[PDB]
Paper text:
The protein N is a multifunctional protein that packs the genomic RNA and enhances the efficiency of virus transcription and assembly. N contains an N-terminal domain, involved in RNA binding, and a C-terminal (NCTD) involved in RNA binding, protein dimerization, and interaction with the viral membrane protein (M). The SARS-CoV-2 NCTD folds into a helical core with a protruding β-hairpin employed for protein dimerization. Here we report the crystal structure of the C-terminal domain (NCTD) in open and closed conformations and in complex with guanine triphosphate, GTP.
The crystal structure of NCTD was solved by molecular replacement to a resolution of 1.94 Å. The crystal asymmetric unit contains two homodimers of NCTD with almost identical conformation (rmsd 0.14 Å). Two monomers are intertwined through the β-hairpin forming a four antiparallel β-sheet on one face of the dimer. In striking contrast to the previously described structures, the superposition of the subunits in our structure shows a ≈5.5 Å movement of the β-hairpin. One subunit presents the β-hairpin in an extended and previously unseen conformation that we named “open”. Whereas the other subunit shows a β-hairpin in a flexed conformation that we named “closed”, similar to other structures of this protein. The alternative conformation of the β-hairpin is associated with the structural displacement of the loop between α1 and α2 (residues 280–283). In the closed conformation the β-hairpin interacts with the C-terminal proline residue (P364) of a symmetry-related protein. This interdimeric interaction between W330 and P364 through a π–π stacking (face-to-face rings interaction), and making hydrogen bonds with T325 and S327, is a common feature with seven NCTD structures determined previously. But strikingly, our structure shows that in the open conformation, the side chain of the residue W330 is rotated 180° towards the β-hairpin making hydrophobic contacts with the side chain of the residues T325 and S327. Therefore, our structure shows that upon a side-chain arrangement the β-hairpin changes from an open conformation to a closed conformation that might favor the interdimeric interaction.
Residue numbers in the entry:
A (entry chain A): 256 to 364
B (entry chain C): 254 to 364
Write the structure that this text describes.
């Protein structure tokens, strides 16, 4: 039922079904290995990924936001960067986990 | 409120958008969203719910976005880009668009 931005992926409604196939196009998402894509927020290390996701206030606070109002459709666009905390004892594990999921689709069979 | 990682911060009247997220401005990775009133008020802005409806859930942030990782002299950064489609068949559509435009780059019109 829900607008795309408010969906929560799970094993019953997975990342592909919720957000489309992972791929190279500007309008496709590129994040997730095979296990994350199948499990969504059921994934065993989801809480470690979700720690980087913005609050509603931070999404509107930190990002560069645009509006593309066209004859074909309107899109709110967003871009930004979130600094990892070097001095967090889990930093090395975070780097590893993010490395596993970013562009992982490139290697799928 | 200020204890939290930046991306989990919640701006309010007591801890405002400038305080939590820095001054609005034109540079990449500097925020550009908010007029004087939203800036002061954060999530106490009367019309915050009509804005927040466009913010993504954590699953959708990682599901919809293009994500990168960049290692620079300033540290390690998780970068992101994406776009959320408005429902142009919703009777509230033009209201929504007016509300978003009112805040996008508002900072250009004041010191």
């Amino acid at each position: 039922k829900k607008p795309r931005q408010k969906r929560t992926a799970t094993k019953a409604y997975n990342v592909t079904q919720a957000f489309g196939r992972r791929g190279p196009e500007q309008t496709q998402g590129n994040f997730g290995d095979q296990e994350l894509i199948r499990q969504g927020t059921d994934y065993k290390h989801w809480p470690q990924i979700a720690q980087f996701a913005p609050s509603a206030s931070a999404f509107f606070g930190m990002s560069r936001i645009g509006m593309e109002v066209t004859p074909s459709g309107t899109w709110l666009t967003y871009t930004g960067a979130i600094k990892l905390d070097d001095k967090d004892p889990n930093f090395k594990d975070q780097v590893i986990l993010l490395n596993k999921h970013i562009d992982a689709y490139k290697t799928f069979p």
